[PDB]
Amino acid sequence: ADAVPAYPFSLPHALDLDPHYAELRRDEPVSRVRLPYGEGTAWLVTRMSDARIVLGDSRFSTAAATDPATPRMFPTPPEPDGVLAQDPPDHTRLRRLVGKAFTARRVEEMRPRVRSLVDSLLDDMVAHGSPADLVEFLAVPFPVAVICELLGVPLEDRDLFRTFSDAMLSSTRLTAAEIQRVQQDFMVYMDGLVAQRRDAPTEDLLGALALATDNDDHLTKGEIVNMGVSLLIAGHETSVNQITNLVHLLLTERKRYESLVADPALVPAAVEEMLRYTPLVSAGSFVRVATEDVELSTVTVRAGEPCVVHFASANRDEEVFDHADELDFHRERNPHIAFGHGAHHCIGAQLGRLELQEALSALVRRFPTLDLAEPVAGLKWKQGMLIRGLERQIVSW
Numbered sequence: 272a273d274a275v276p277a278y279p280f281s282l283p284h285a286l287d288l289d290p291h292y293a294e295l296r297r298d299e300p301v302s303r304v305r306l307p308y309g310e311g312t313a314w315l316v317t318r319m320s321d322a323r324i325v326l327g328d329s330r331f332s333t334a335a336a337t338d339p340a341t342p343r344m345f346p347t348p349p350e351p352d353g354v355l356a357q358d359p360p361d362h363t364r365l366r367r368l369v370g371k372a373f374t375a376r377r378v379e380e381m382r383p384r385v386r387s388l389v390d391s392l393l394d395d396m397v398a399h400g401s402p403a404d405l406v407e408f409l410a411v412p413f414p415v416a417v418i419c420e421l422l423g424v425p426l427e428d429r430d431l432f433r434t435f436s437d438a439m440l441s442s443t444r445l446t447a448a449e450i451q452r453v454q455q456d457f458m459v460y461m462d463g464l465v466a467q468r469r470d471a472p473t474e475d476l477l478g479a480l481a482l483a484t485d486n487d488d489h490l491t492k493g494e495i496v497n498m499g500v501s502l503l504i505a506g507h508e509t510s511v512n513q514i515t516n517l518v519h520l521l522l523t524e525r526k527r528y529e530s531l532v533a534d535p536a537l538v539p540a541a542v543e544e545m546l547r548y549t550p551l552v553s554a555g556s557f558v559r560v561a562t563e564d565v566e567l568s569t570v571t572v573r574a575g576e577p578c579v580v581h582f583a584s585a586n587r588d589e590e591v592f593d594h595a596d597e598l599d600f601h602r603e604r605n606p607h608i609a610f611g612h613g614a615h616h617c618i619g620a621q622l623g624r625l626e627l628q629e630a631l632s633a634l635v636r637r638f639p640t641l642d643l644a645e646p647v648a649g650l651k652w653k654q655g656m657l658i659r660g661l662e663r664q665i666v667s668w
């Protein structure tokens with residue numbers, strides 16, 4: 272069965288959805304693909320109802336996907352101690368190590384700190400004058416500062432952990448051996464920061480991770496340190512890219528930006544809609560393997576068959592969202608899965624929402640004249656990574 276198409280279906284263009292995803296949702300919503308690594312074939316799931324089953328059911332296992340022969344989107348076999356590769360109830364125990372810092376209530380308590388950080392960084396951009404690179408002054412330093420303060424990672428390590436993090440998000444830019452090397456380096460660095468808390472615990476998540484290493488009974492050192500790596504990767508890589516992505520959607524059809532200048536209270540709802548609209552995950556997902564037969568819309572997936580979701584395709588499902596292909600800030604309902612679903616639903620969802628809200632609210636309030644000040648055709652979209660975003664975004668005002 273080398274008659275099954277390669278997935279991804281193409282090198283990506285900006286934030287475009289391959290038009291094949293809409294054809295798949297209409298006519299073949301569950302279809303066999305060959306992923307770029309591991310062996311064999313995977314079902315690609317393109318509709319919302321099927322995505323909620325694959326993401327939401329104990330009969331689908333991520334643990335089972337750690338087999339190096341399992342199809343996957345990324346060069347290195349999955350790390351078995353990785354939070355994504357855990358199944359409940361062990362996954363539930365692992366998430367509770369840190370989950371209290373990420374509840375909507377605790378995240379809301381960060382809004383003051385977070386708005387202060389944004390204000391200061393836009394002051395520096397103003398000091399530099401127009402035009403300036405929004406990536407340099409906002410999209411990079413803002414989420415990096417927030418995740419360093421929440422975990423207790425020194426800000427001086429920015430260049431070191433951003434390099435490791437970009438490598439671990441490789442799709443084609445690096446080989447398995449280059450990434451496996453970075454994984455070991457990152458594991459050894461994070462293990463070292465957590466060890467610093469041996470006779471010196473801190474009031475931060477690394478503090479919590481170091482106590483769990485000392486006192487905790489069901490979780491390995493590996494699982495615990497790896498959680499530190501996942502949070503430090505996700506905690507900046509998502510938001511840094513999503514700020515560039517959402518600003519890109521706002522300035523390339525400037526009525527969108529103008530609608531938020533007019534009404535900055537629209538910003539929370541605009542952030543939800545642009546989370547729906549944006550393929551932050553360039554293609555596919557961490558894989559789920561059926562442990563029993565499971566009925567999806569058009570097929571029964573057999574025990575042992577792997578499945579992969581395209582989150583941004585589920586987020587264009589025309590049986591769930593009216594005019595799904597259109598950016599609409601006035602949707603009454605937006606049941607998107609930009610943050611996933613089921614056990615592995617994004618732990619940082621509330622922190623992402625907060626950072627995007629405060630970054631956009633500030634821009635829309637203080638920079639009514641904001642425009643893209645480099646050509647669209649020349650935009651430096653990140654190539655060869657599992658996520659999408661801009662290396663640079665020169666803006667004027």
Ligand code: HEM
Nearest residue numbers: 354355501505506509513557609610611615617618619623
């Ligand atoms: C706009 C921001 C974000 C987006 C769009 C986003 C998106 C996602 C998605 C779709 C997943 C599900 C992956 C899957 O099940 O296959 C996920 C999981 C995850 N996200 Fe986020 N995320 C964001 C922000 C964050 C932040 C700020 C953090 C960390 C502070 C974070 C940490 C994670 C982690 C650790 C997981 C894995 C959770 C688990 O396996 O239980 N994310 N994210």
Ligand SMILES: CC[C@H]1OC(=O)[C@H](C)[C@@H](O)[C@H](C)[C@@H](O)[C@@H](C)C[C@@H](C)C(=O)[C@H](C)[C@@H](O)[C@H]1C
Nearest residue numbers: 344345439440501504505509552555556557657
């Ligand atoms: C195949 C696409 C996915 O990538 C992966 O699985 C990566 C190899 C993970 O190891 C990354 C590096 C982890 O750090 C995650 C915790 C990051 C967090 C933001 C996500 O879960 C993210 C959505 C992720 O699932 C997708 C990018």
Ligand SMILES: C[C@@H]1O[C@@H](O)[C@H](O)[C@H](O)[C@H]1O
Nearest residue numbers: 350353354355500501504
């Ligand atoms: C941060 C993330 O952590 C786990 O999910 C993986 O095993 C891997 O080490 C890394 O990609």
Ligand code: NA
Nearest residue numbers: 518519643664
């Ligand atoms: Na742009």
Ligand code: NA
Nearest residue numbers: 336343557558
């Ligand atoms: Na996988």
